[PDB]
Point group: C4
Chain length 92, copies 4
Amino acid sequence: VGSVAALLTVVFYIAAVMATNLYGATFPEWFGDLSKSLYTLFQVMTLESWSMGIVRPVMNVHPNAWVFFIPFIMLTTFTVLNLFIGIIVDAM
Amino acid sequence: VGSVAALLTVVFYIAAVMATNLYGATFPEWFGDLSKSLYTLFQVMTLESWSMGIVRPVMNVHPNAWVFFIPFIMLTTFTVLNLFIGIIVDAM
Amino acid sequence: VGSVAALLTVVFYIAAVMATNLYGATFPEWFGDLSKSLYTLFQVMTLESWSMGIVRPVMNVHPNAWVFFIPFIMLTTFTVLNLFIGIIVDAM
Amino acid sequence: VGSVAALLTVVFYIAAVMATNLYGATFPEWFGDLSKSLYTLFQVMTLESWSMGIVRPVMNVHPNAWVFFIPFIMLTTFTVLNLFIGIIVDAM
Ligand code: NA
Ligand code: NA
Ligand code: NA
Ligand code: NA
Ligand code: NA
């Protein structure tokens, strides 16, 4: 559980650094600084307006944006699901 | 199961009192009274428009709003997942 | 599994009859006929725009609409979760 | 696990070919080519704006669109849930 929660924190920090760098200048409200980025990636992780609200507008400037966001979702939504199950199993 | 469902009710009532107090005057449709608050926090819990629809507009007035909402989500979405699993395990 | 899937079909049909009757005349695009109702309740079940898109607009006419929709969500989202888990357990 | 992930890839490719053909000319931003289709169906699978954002606008042109999209959701959202559970079980 401890290693999974740490893996997620490292993945969240690398992705938020990458997103700040990639989409900060073109999309500043969403990825203008590491903090705006970390908040956005969390929203993307919960699946809230990920495509209509974030990814589709980003793609009109960066057509390949899906290469970053889709894997991010596939990885984080899996890790979170694994972490939540891991806590319950250990609690029993 | 009984203790988990009671923990959630107490957490939902404390958060809806806190939200009424914090964002009631600035965002009255969403947190103007305990009832509007309880309904909103449920919507936030289901993840429906949590960021684009509620949290981002709230943040333009209260920049730290994420300190309240993100933990609320992390706690309630975990407890609900734990409660739903708990019912099935006991049913077997 | 068979009894759970049948319970859900009966619950979906009763709710879609109730919604047609309650919100059909005031909200015809969403609940104007049993079929429009069944499609909407499915959208509500998946959690897609349930509050911002459906429930909040319905509440401006019917303030208690939450007494119908919130329990519907709590019941159907639990039954579906139970049904999906039930299929996997039986498959092993 | 390997057979489930392969089943999903085949289902995603058949559906994205079908959607290109069915709704490409009438809805080109969403289904104009196999790639736009694959990206959209993924968004539909995550449940993000599936009805308000995609299915309801598509239905104003193609009233039966629900015969394609609802089963697609029921199948893919089940397979993904089964695949994610399958990985954890094998990991133990
Ligand atoms: Na959801
Ligand atoms: Na939404
Ligand atoms: Na959603
Ligand atoms: Na979701
Ligand atoms: Na949405």
